[PDB]
Every structure is written in C-alpha cells, then in structure tokens.
Amino acid sequence: GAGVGKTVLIQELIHNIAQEHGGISVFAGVGERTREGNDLYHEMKDSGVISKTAMVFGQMNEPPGARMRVALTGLTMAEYFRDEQGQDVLLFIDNIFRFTQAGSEVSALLGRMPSAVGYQPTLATEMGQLQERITSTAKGSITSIQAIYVPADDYTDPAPATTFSHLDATTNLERKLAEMGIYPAVDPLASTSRALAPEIVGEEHYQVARKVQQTLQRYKELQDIIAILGMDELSDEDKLVVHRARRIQFFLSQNFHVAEQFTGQPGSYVPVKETVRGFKEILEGKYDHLPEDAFRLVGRIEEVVEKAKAM
Amino acid sequence: TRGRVIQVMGPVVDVKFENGHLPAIYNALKIQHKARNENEVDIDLTLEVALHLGDDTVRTIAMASTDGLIRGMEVIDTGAPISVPVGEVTLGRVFNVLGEPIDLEGDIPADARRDPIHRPAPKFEELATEVEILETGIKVVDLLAPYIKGGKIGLFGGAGVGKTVLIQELIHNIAQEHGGISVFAGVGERTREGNDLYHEMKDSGVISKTAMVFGQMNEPPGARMRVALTGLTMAEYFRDEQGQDVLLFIDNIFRFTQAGSEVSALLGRMPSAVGYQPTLATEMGQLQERITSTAKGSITSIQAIYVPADDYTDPAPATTFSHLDATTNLERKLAEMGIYPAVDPLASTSRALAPEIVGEEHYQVARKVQQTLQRYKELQDIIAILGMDELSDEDKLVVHRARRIQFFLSQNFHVAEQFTGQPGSYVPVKETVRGFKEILEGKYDHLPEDAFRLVGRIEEVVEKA
Amino acid sequence: SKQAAAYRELSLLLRRPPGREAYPGDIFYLHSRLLERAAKLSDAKGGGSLTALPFVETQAGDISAYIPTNVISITDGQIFLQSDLFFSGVRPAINAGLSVSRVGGAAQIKAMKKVAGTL
Amino acid sequence: LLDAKASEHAARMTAMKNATDNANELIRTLTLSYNRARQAAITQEITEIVAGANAL
Amino acid sequence: DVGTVIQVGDGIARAHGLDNVMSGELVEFANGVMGMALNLEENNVGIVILGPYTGIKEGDEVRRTGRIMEVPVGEALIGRVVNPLGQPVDGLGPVETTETRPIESRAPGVMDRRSVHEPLQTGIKAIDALVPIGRGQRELIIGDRQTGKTSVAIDTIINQKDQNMISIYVAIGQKESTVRTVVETLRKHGALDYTIVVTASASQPAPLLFLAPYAGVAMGEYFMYKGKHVLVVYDDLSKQAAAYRELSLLLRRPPGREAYPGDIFYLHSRLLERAAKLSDAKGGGSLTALPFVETQAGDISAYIPTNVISITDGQIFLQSDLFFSGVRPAINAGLSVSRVGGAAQIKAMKKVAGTLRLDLAAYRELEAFAKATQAKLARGARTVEVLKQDLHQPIPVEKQVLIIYALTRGFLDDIPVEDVRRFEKEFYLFLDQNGQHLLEHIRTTKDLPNEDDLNKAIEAFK
Amino acid sequence: VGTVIQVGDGIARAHGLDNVMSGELVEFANGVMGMALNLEENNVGIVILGPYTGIKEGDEVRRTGRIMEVPVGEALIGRVVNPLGQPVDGLGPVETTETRPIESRAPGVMDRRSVHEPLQTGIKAIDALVPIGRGQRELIIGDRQTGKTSVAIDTIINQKDQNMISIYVAIGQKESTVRTVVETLRKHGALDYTIVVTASASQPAPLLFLAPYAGVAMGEYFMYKGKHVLVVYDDLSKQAAAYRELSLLLRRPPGREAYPGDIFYLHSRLLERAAKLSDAKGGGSLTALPFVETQAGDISAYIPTNVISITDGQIFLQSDLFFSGVRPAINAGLSVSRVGGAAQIKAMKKVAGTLRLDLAAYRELEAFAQFGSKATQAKLARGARTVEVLKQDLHQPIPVEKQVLIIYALTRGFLDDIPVEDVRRFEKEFYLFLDQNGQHLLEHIRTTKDLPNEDDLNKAIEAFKKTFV
C-alpha cells in the first residue's frame, strides 16, 4: 500500500544481489519520486555497479505518455541482452501500477467508456501485452522483480486482481504490520510461492514452514477473542499459542543494511540454513524465558541471547 | 406490407414498417426463413414489439436464438399478442412459451380457440366480498395458516426437503375433493429438471389433471419474462368460462424479477436503484393483480422464494412480500427425524388467522398451538444437556404434549404410494378443529407418540394405536 | 482540498466526462505538477532550498479516501493529526505510529543522533 | 464456602445470559448498515457509469 | 390545434404541432384516454398518459382540452367511488357535478390562518390520550408493514358521524381485496353516504398513482372554503414517491441519493401545504390530513421518511415488535410527538390525565432494566392494558375520559392484570343505569363534573 | 466486399458488407480473421481474433460466407490446440477431416435421461460427500490459490481405467503455467486421452471469449458418436472480462457493474449443452466443471450468484480453512449436490449417513464447544478423527474401492484408537496391507459394485489392528 516499506526492501535486494550476480542489471522506475531516482544514480556511481548497469527515468513530472513507455524501455534493453548476447539479466521494475493508472487518465479523452471503479475497458488487453514479454527462455534466463502499489490499501480492486494472475511468487505487505513497528511488513499468511514443493526445497523445509504458517494462522482468531473474553478466561493451553506466536512473529523482523539511515545500525547477515535452524529452535522450546522485546530487529538467532545479555 | 429488418444487436432487433401502418405495442411478429443456398441459414424467430422510435421504426426483443439474420429480410404481422390454445386440449401436456408442445405426442390442431396473454385486469365491481377459506386437507396447513381463495402464498424450506411432492399432492387433492384444473409454470428453469419432474408426475398419474409451461435457461430474456403470463391465460380461461377453483404454481419469482432486470438493461433504460428497472413496481403488479377471486371462482397461487443476499430490504423481496398473504417454512432439522412434511410451525405466518375470519374456537386452537410449542422450542437446549426427570412438572408436561404435537404434523399422501405403499388419507377442515382441540386438552396423551406418524385423521390414529 | 474542489467544478462545466468521483482523474497529474516544483539544488546550481508544508482535509478523517491516498503518494512524508486524541490532551495531536518521514536522519544536528535517533 | 461456590456459578450463569443477548441486535443492525452501504455503493457506481455513457 | 404523435415510449409520448398548448393542460387522445403536458421544447411537446397506453399508435390525433388540471367537485360525488380523472368506478350512472377546482391552485398563506384549540375526535384511546390531534394539524402515520395502519384510519373515519365532517379516503398502489373489504365495511356502517373514496390500484399506470392525492385534496378543500370541516387520509405516500421515481427515471433526470430526484421536498410540499384553518375572510372551516408512510426496514433515518417528516407537524411510528407482543394498535410511548399543547383536549383531560405520557414512557424504559420502583412497576401493566381496544369499538369521548380518570387516579390497583380488560367492558354497563347525568354534563360544559360526586360514583361499582 | 473506417483496441467498424450475417466470418488482406457482432444501419462491428497492429483505414474486407467451424477428430487427442483450429505445438497439421459448427442446439427435455452412474477423481471428500454423476454439471467458485487446479488435475489423471475422453481448457493464462501443468500430466501419461485448449494473455480477448465454446464443440462429437466426454475449465469468469471489453468498445449499454445483461444468456447458451443423451440419438454422456473467480469470498457478487443459478450444485473453496490442513479446501456446509444420492456405488450409500451424523455436528459444534473439557466429548473426539482422516497428500489419487473400504473402517468405529497425528500414516499402511491380505474383496467390489459380506469384511480390519504399530 501507501508508505508500507516497499522501497527499502527493493533497495536491499539490489544491494545484495547485483553486487555478486554477474548478470546485466536494469532498474526502471515507472511511478516513484524523483528524489529517490536522483539519489540512486549517485549511490550507484559510488557502489561500482555502474559499470554493469543501465537506467531509465522520467518519473512523475510528465504526462501519462512517458509513464507508460518508461516501463517497456528497460525491457527493450533486457531483450537484446538476452536474445543475442545471452548473459543472465536482472530486471527491477518499480511501481508498474502507474502504467495502468496512466491509461485511465487518457482513456476518458480517447472515447472509451468508464468501467467498474473507473478504469479503462482495455485493462487486461493492455496489461497482458507487457506481462508476457518479460519471460525466461531456453536461450537465456531473466530474473525480474516488480513493485505493485495497491490503490486504496484494499486488495479487491480490479488492478490487483488482474496483476495477481502472472506472478510466480507474491509477498504481501499489510499497513497494520507497518504500524506495529515490526519491519519488514510481510504478512506470512497471504505470501505464497511455487517453490514450496518437496522436490525443490526438501523435507527439512516443508514441515517447519507449514507448522509456523499454521500456528500463525491459528493465533489470528484467538488474539481477536482475547480482545473481549479477557486474558485468563481462555485455557492455559490456548494461551501457550499466543505465548509462542508472539515470539515467532517478533523474530520475523530483521535489521537491514540499507536502512542504516533510519536505524543507525549496520545490520547483520544470515544464511538460509540458519533461518530453518532458528525456527526449529524457536519451536523446540529453547527460548521460552527470553523477553519478546528482545527479538525486535535482530538477524541471526545468536544475536538474541546477546541482546538479553545487553538488557 | 410485411416489415423489414435494418438493425440487429444480439437479443434486441429493430424493425421497419413503411407507410406508417405500424403495429401495436406488445404485439407479436413472426419471421419465416429458409436458406436459398449454402450462403444462408434457416431460422424461424419471433419478436415482440416493446417501443416505437419514429421514422416508421420499432424496437423488438427476441424470443429465441437470433443468429443468421440478414438486412433486407422480411418479418410478418399477426395483429394480436402471443396467443395460447385453451380448452380440453391443454390438459396433460407440456408447452413452451410460444405455445407449441415440447413432447412428441403431436401438435394441437388449428380449430381450437386461442386466447391472448396481455389483457386488462378484472375490475372493481367483480371481486368477491367474503374471505372464503380454501380447504386443503393438510393437517398443519389447515390449522396454522389457512389459505384464502384468490390470495397468494409463499414457500420457504431447506435444500431438497420435499419441495416437489408438496406441490403434486395439492393437484390430486383439488381433483379428488373439489375438482379443478392446475397449471405449473417454470420461470427460466433448468432443462434437465423438467424431465425429472415429468417422470415423477407420470408415475403418480397426476399429469393428466394439469397443464405445464416451460421456459428454459438457454432462452433469451425476452421469452423468460413471458412464461408466467403465458400460463396465467390457461389458468384464467377455466375460471372464466367454466368455473371452479384453479391453482397456478410459480417456481421462482426471483428469476422473474431478474429477467426483468436483464431486459431492462437491454432496452436502454437507465438502471434504477440497485440497477433494477424504473418500472419495477408496475411490471410485477400486472401479474399479481390478475390472480384474484370473483364471485364464481378463484385462481390461487403457490410460489417459492429466493433472496439475493438475505437482504429483505432489497427492492425485489420488498416489492414482493407486501403482495403475499401467507408464508410457510420447512426445516431440515425436523426432516432428519423423518417428519414428512417438515413444515416449520413457528416461521409460518398468514394474515387470515383472525377471529373474525375463522371463529373464536378455531382462532384459540390455532394460536395456542404456537403458544405452547414455544416452551419446547426454548427448553430443547437445556434438555439436550441434562436429563428431563429432574425438572419441574411444567417442563415434563410441556415435553409430554410437545412430543405429540411434533409427530401429529405428518400425514400420508396419495403420491407417497410409489415409494411407500399407503392408501392416502385426508383431513376434514371441520374435523381438524375438533381433533386439535381434543389433543391440546390432553384427551389423547396416553397414546404412544410415534404412532401419531403419517396419517390424516385422529380416528385412524386411535385405530392404529 | 478546496483547490481540488475548485478544479473539479472548473472541469465539470467544460463538458469533460467525470471519473472515480466527482473529482476528475487528472488530480494526480495536477499535484505532480505542483509538489515536484520544489528542489534542493546542488553546488553547481546555487545550493538553495525550497520546502513546502501542504495542508489537506478529508471528510470524517477518512485517510483511505481518494484525495488523501492520492496526495500521500507524492509527498516525502505525512503528519497525521487525529481528532480523537485532540481532546484527550495531547497537543499537537500528532500520531507517532502512522506519521512517516522519508528523509529521516539526513538533515538533522548530530547531537540528536546520539540521544533520540530511534525514539 | 459451598454456598458461595454455588452462588458463584449462579452469578456466572446470569452473566452469560445477559451477555448473549445484545450481540444479536448488534449483528442485525450492522447487517442492515451493510446492505445500505452495498446499495449506496452500487447506486453511486451505476450513476457514474451512466453519466459517463451519456457524456460519451 | 392539430398534430401527430411520433413517440409512444413507456407511457410517455412526444407530440408535434400544438401551437397554443399551455403548461399543465389536460389533453385527450383519439383513443379516448386523458393525458397531460409537462414540457414544451422548441418543436415538440411532452405528454404523460393517464391510462392504458397500449392503444396509442404513431400518427394518432391528439386534442386540446382548453383548461388547466381541473377535477370536478360537489355534492353529487358523495356516495360514489370515483377515478381521479373524474369517472365513477362502480357504475351507477354518470356524475352530475358542475363545479370544478384546479388541483394546482395556490395555497392560502399569510393573514389566512389561525391557531388550533379544538380536537379531532378519533375514539382510539391510546392516540387522543397521549398524542392529541386538532383540526388544521397534519399528523404523519408512518411505520412498518403488516402492523395495522389502515385499521386506525378506518376507525377514525367511522367515528366522525357525530361531528358532521365530510371526508375523503384515498387508496394508492393498493390491492383491490383490501380496497373492497374497506368499501364493504363503510357501506355496511353507512359511511359512504358522506365520505368519498378515490382509488388508484397497483395494476394502474404510475401517473395515476402520482396524481391521486392531488385530486383527493382538491375535492376535499372545496367544502372547507364553503365553511365546512373536512378530514382527508392518504393510503401510502411511499408508493407515490416510488411512482415519481419511476416517472423521473423514464424522463432521464439525474438521480440523487437512492435514485430519488431532488423534487421530493417540492412535490410533497405542493401537496401538503394545502391544509389550513381559514380566517374570517373565507370562513372558520379547517382540514386535517393523515398521510401514510411505509418503512422498508423500520429505520427512520431513510431519505423519504425524513423528507416527509420535514413538512408534517408530527408523527406516530408504528412498530412491528409490538405487533407480536399482544398489543394492538402498535403505539410507542417513546418517539412520537404532537406539537399542539394540552389545552386542545377537553379541560378535564389536561386537568387530570395529562401525566399519562410520562407515566407510560418512564415504565417503557424502566422495564428494560427490571420498594418505590417495585410499586412503580405495578402501574405500567395497567397503563398499557387499559389503553388496549379491539376492532370497531370506538368508545365515546365522555366514557373515554371517565375511564382514563379511573385509571390515572389509581382506582384499578385491586383488579388483577388479566381481568383489567373485563372491568372496562362491565364498567360502561354500570354508568348508563347509574351515572347518566355525567355524560350530558361532559358533553355540554366541556369540563370535569363535581369531584366529590365523580369520586362517589365509583365506589358503587367497586 | 467493403472498407474499414475505424480501428482501435482490436475492434473495427466497416462500411459496406451488405449481406453479412450475424456471426459470419470476415477476412482482411493481412490474413487475420474477424467476427461480426453488431449490425448497425451504416456500419458493421468486426471483432478481431489476432494481432491488429498492421490493419489500416481503407483496407478491404472480404466476406467468407460461412459460420464458425471447428475441426474435430480422435487423432487430436494429445495435441495442444488453440480455441481456433490452428496448431500451437507444431508437429504438422491437426489430422482432422470433419468440422462442427459451434452453434449446436442444446438437447431437448425428452432427449435426456436420469443419471445414476458416477464420475471419479480420487479424493475422499469430493467423490463422496458432494457426489457427481456422469451427466452432472458442478460449480467450483473461489479466489486465487486454495488449490482449484488440483481438482481438475485429479479429475483428469484418475480417469485411467474408466474410459473418459477429456478436454482441459486454460483461458487467458500465462503459457509457462500451462506448459508446467502439461509436463506434470506427461509424467502420468494423461496425454493419451486428453486435449488441451490454450489462449494466452498476449492473444486477443476474443480468443478468451471463444475458448469455452470450442471446449464444448470439440467434446460433443464423441458424445454424438457414442463416447463419454469430460470437459474442465481452468477459469471461466475471465469470459466476462473479455465480454466486457468488446461490449464496452462496441458501445453496448452498460449494466449493474458494466456487465451487459447478456451474461445469463452467454453462459447458458454453453452450460446447457451437457446432458445424458437418450437412445433415440445416442447413449453418450457429458459432464462439465465450470470455474469462477471471487474477490475475498464475496459470494453475493454478481457473477457468482449468476452462475450459481444454472449449476446442479456448488463447491466453494474457502481460504481461511485452506491453512487448517484440509486440502483441497472443500467445506461441507456451503456445498450440496441436488443430484447426489443416486450416482454412487451401493457400497457408499450404505454408510455415508453415519459419516454425516458425525461431521455435520462437528463442523458446527467445534468452534465453541471445544474449550469445555461422555457422549459429547466422544462426539468431539470422533469428529476430530474424521476431519483428520479426510485429508490427502499431494497428487495421490485413490480408486473408489479403497475409498469405500476406508470410509467403512472409519464409520464402524474401529478406527478411533489410532491417535490424531498418526492417522495419515494409518490410512496408507492400510492401503499397503489390503493387497497382501487379499484381492477377493477388491474383485467383488469391482464386479458387483456392492459391499461384500460384512462378517468377512471385518476380518481384514481385525487382522490388521493386531499388527499395527
């Protein structure tokens, strides 16, 4: 939605991945602020990624005609890099929603009638001609990340409904998590991917992920019942679900490296093995007596026992 | 000169009549076409006039599939609205909206007289001035919700809980006890379920005493709106020229209003509130006001109801409900115990249950049933968790009487024979009051309660016990 | 907000079709023409500073409405003034949870970093 | 103590019996508000759509 | 004064020619149906059809009546049921009325009105005892369906024989079964020999439903302007509002909230501002109106209920939860007010029983929470029981105020609740053989009799 | 022949074409086909089935002289085809000789027959509690995810022994997803009795509009020649979207949510074509499974309630239960089948009543009665074990006989001693035990379609329980 935290995560991604990955990187901005776009070029000129990266801009201060084609310009570059040269390509595309939104503003003048909320009638036809161009082929592999802004923080809107049909993995952000102060604001419940299959992630991944997902689904209604029924009228076995789900949700927070301006902290680094390992311990019962507030904005699980030592 | 087509947009077709000899609104026009070569396709579409547009131009809504029309083809005139044959030929057969029969039992000859559909309603000086209660012979229905000759009754119930046998019982009872004619109309109903209904009628020997009209779901909205008014003519002609009580079942009024919505969206009228037509209150009223009772007979209708989102304030339920005189409900929680029919005794309401209409004793006996069943309805929750024997004398007597009012509801029917062999029985209306008065006083409390199952007279109950 | 209403009622008599509300769909464009006019120019340009403090009003404090969400997408932050804290005795009634500022600690004296950088 | 423990369960019975009632009224009134909000939303949407269609 | 019709769409027509046609004029088609003109464009005239439009074709001749919307009035319509256009319904020959009134006439205004101090005897205890009405007042009857609104109007109109008030009953969008039941009740009781019944059923086109109340008030005020008193009742304003929405949406006007056009406050005002109590420049007559409004879900906050309240001087909101509780009519002691002071009632009423409203509303709220309050609760059940009455039992006003005095003074505290309604029927059998003088004293002096004798009367019965 | 005047968004208006019929094909010089959908006084509205970027004003348009035709044939099985008769997988032509019109009339009421012979997919929940017959149309409604495609894949895969020529259609979907599904099917050899129709997002919306009509036209030929046919839709609501776009571009008057009122017609003109034909024409049968999109479970929406009226039942998939463990997320409360109770093997009918007498009570009592800790707790525990035993792992279809065996094992009360977490192991190790115990029960259920002797049926359960670990 609006002001949830998309850009910090996307810049963490381009910091972590492009610095190691040898693929040609293209970052295209469709609807964000000009200040971020101008700052990113200087940050690139310092980072050393400028040798292997190209950028396209134009941003908000222009009518819809430029905001529509600015998305496809970077894809036009990545297409030549994939089809002929054959190296891997990274493609970050930022706020493609404004490709849709721009199409609304001209539509009323082009003779098309309004539809539904007010979007132009050619939503699917205009959007498909774009979403099916960015694909991986047998000749080369394209890895593409996109930013989507929900028009009114509510997902039952024709634009998100039309966008939902093309992604291979989606992560949702809820403004409630933004207000709770547990960043990033990814809601585990509605975040799904094709990778959660036994032949890709293995059995050591599936059971733990499913147990954590199911526990976080179960806590959702009990915490609402608590709001009226009280705090000890519920049974102790039921209260244990909250007692552990609070820790599980708090440990989801991470101290990022690009948020040093907002955090004032350098961060920490974790590999996936440590993530599966740490969730297994948190379900094992090894950390029942450490305070919940100690789990806020930490990386590797080994840090938590230090922070309690700090307290 | 016959009309000519100049404009086709899906279900809606415009026609032209040179020299200004246009036809009237709600007339019927027919088209007969055959391929002269492979470059043409055969079609026999018919149209209904709905609006004039000037410059000798008329708007029409299609009654069937409309593909293959060509600019320059001709449409012929009829001079009258759609007409259905009436008389002895109508009984025992099934027809579509246009009139032709759907079975393979041949056509209907051209010498039989045919009656139109669109006609003015009966006037003020011809209405019946007395509340004559129709006799149904069904034990619960004759007590908790008497039917009024000329009035309307709505049906609610659970999924598949005897929604079709309660209709086929009434036709047989009308034929046996008073004598009459019944018509069954399907408003945009499924083509598949028509076969099931036809066979379940045929194995009961009841189709011979009724006439039926179907409009399938694959038909365009122009024809799906006209089926009820189509059957109304067959129902009315036997109340006009011959004289006897006539029934007219309507399967679902929701799809009638929804067909109105579809055709109004097609006609170019701006949607009213919640998208319905602006003429919602007058297009329905023309149907409700033809079903009346004059001094010589009556048309009475039974209708099932659907609700859009359980929103009673929605325009369609809001405009329908005020026109209904009775409403009854069916519960599956009782049907699971085998109490056929599982009619709800508490959700069923009717305006006729008044002392001025039914007399003092029948009013008292009808109301006290609902009064005394409430104690059971409320105590069932505590009964379900603790035993009865520890309760007070009032709870015991309430359970003791309620277990018999609960099972007395049932009655074997004539259609029940083909799956449960029984002769079939009837409940006299004058005897129903005596019976329920005698039960509610506790004169039959000593009989075993489940012996009260599926029969229509207390004396037979005594014999069976 | 009254300027948005003035633009709406200016557009309506020109015989231009409406959109999501009575508000025309060009509103975002208009605001993009306005708020982006500010700049913090570099050393080779003059090194000035033009900062703005726009005010926006919404009916019943509905932050999810069309104009509030449209406006938020452009600015570098938001101070949300909530009416139900106003009477409780917290003046100004700035909501410390919902308000956001994008530039953060870039322009701030270094004494405050050592003390209340994350308060 | 036995008398008090019996009166405690009696008081709890009464507390739940009062608590279980106002819920249904609150649901019925919110559901009515829900249908009114629906109908208003659909009416506004159709009015905007037909105004746009008439304009174009 | 000739032309041709070129559009016959959905009960609305467009006509060529008609050079001299005026706004609001009556028009006749060659088919024999009446219509009217509401809009005159540069080269065409819009016509609204007041009957069966299935017989109109393009090119039909259409003709000018030559006058504004006049409906016939007079004494010859008494004893007949008439169509709003001026046609008898049940036959019995053509009407002989000569005089006519335009139903669009300008309402009387400043220097033509006067306060209200005299009651409209309704005979329904719970209304006159709690929510009084006076001549010239406009009282809203509003509420839910299937609760008994019409049973109030019928009783009120039967009770008017002793006050000599010619009256009109209007039925809009209604089913003929109830219409003829009401007509049979009136002809049985004889009310048709001074009342006039106008009907416009649900099987009739919308414009008749839209015009019916205007004729119903135009044929009623004529007797006012000649000095007589008139009572007018309308069966439903909600159906008229729906018919106006239908007509406006066929006319392609921009809908507002709930698709109801903005003329709603206008249309009803031009209908409801005709009621007045004329000054001495015309006569002392007065007219009172009882319009009806049906709520879709029983929620007052809707558009039409509030807009209709805005004009009227009061309302009684009929509930449905009271209907199944064993109380009829469903009258709420809470949110129902009349703006006329207590002096409108006869002086005994204000003198003694004016506290009934407080006594009843306080109990109606206090029962929800349920020595002093224990004693207070005992009175409420009697306060609601004594106000109960059955169908077609209009109690005389003298006996009415006498039983209200007996109730308000605590004479009934010994009688058990279930027997209360028995006392009420036996008590009147007592006075006619023991207290006949008090009735004539009440009728003449409009004031309470001697307190000592009134108190002494009751002990004989007790 | 005529000229084109207006072009845009794949829609064209042409002047000329005097004798063009409604639905007649038209062609341009560029070779892309088009369909006439609106016939005005001086212009004809042409809707284009392919890439339109190359058409210019002033181009000539030629009348083909025929209605839509779709080639059909048994050799097509295995091939992946467009909704139009063109090859998409390559490998030469489509190997067809006869072509069918798309406008085939629905069967009459006297040409049908009652249905009592079942269809199977291999899932304990759907195959039993919401049964489907070999002449039934059944509705699947839901939001994105919750595993709707798994139902189609199980319905197609499980039809190995029981002959059923199948047509799977994927409308408006990304081509990578359909290729992944095709390869997953290829691992089980489903291409020997399946045909796939795909129209990608890049393809014009008219192909999405025409796809399900071809998904029934290609499948009715085996019926009318006397073969049993199944048709499954990946998503049908997308129809409306395409029908919206063109209808709005053609300037047809709006409706409730810009859906023109023709939707009821447009769906029905297809969905009524599934039937169990009579012997006067041919003893074939056809069944269909339409799919509908929904926004966060708002079942009261326009299109969902529109499609509910037509079908003989409903299977709604609920998202907040999708994470409770039961997959696919079929709820026994909202889903009923009007045709159910007849299309079963008599082994199932003798037992399902007790299964409901546990489940229908549990699925309403559990939400509030679970907190308070003989008969009521026994009901609670039994219901817990039932809702545990109905689950299934990813893509392991089961034949009908093992389904009825385990349902009989559960309902009779012999199963409630295995604890809650181990049930998923038990339900499979029974499957492995039965084969080493004997095939005679399995043979009897296969031949007579009736439960075997209970006195002998119970012995396998008794012998297993003596050795379960």
Ligand SMILES: Nc1ncnc2c1ncn2[C@@H]1O[C@H](COP(=O)(O)OP(=O)(O)NP(=O)(O)O)[C@@H](O)[C@H]1O
């Ligand atoms: N780890 C963090 N700790 C504290 N604040 C944070 C953190 N991450 C993000 N934020 C804050 O959240 C804001 C999110 O900015 P941004 O990502 O641009 O919003 P957005 O989600 O992209 N909405 P938009 O930019 O309009 O599409 C930042 O400006 C910070 O103020």
Ligand SMILES: Nc1ncnc2c1ncn2[C@@H]1O[C@H](COP(=O)(O)OP(=O)(O)NP(=O)(O)O)[C@@H](O)[C@H]1O
């Ligand atoms: N005061 C009353 N006491 C007893 N019975 C009554 C009373 N009023 C009405 N009834 C009965 O209840 C029925 C309903 O009254 P009725 O006046 O027809 O309601 P209504 O106002 O017409 N409802 P509606 O048609 O929706 O406006 C009457 O026919 C009587 O039998």
Ligand SMILES: Nc1ncnc2c1ncn2[C@@H]1O[C@H](COP(=O)(O)OP(=O)(O)NP(=O)(O)O)[C@@H](O)[C@H]1O
């Ligand atoms: N029984 C099951 N158990 C576990 N996971 C399942 C099961 N059935 C399906 N899935 C999951 O279903 C996913 C496939 O996507 P799916 O949820 O079916 O897409 P869909 O939205 O429901 N249908 P579609 O519109 O074609 O994408 C896989 O990641 C599986 O993990």
Ligand SMILES: [Mg+2]
């Ligand atoms: Mg951002």
Ligand SMILES: [Mg+2]
């Ligand atoms: Mg009434």
Ligand SMILES: [Mg+2]
């Ligand atoms: Mg899928």
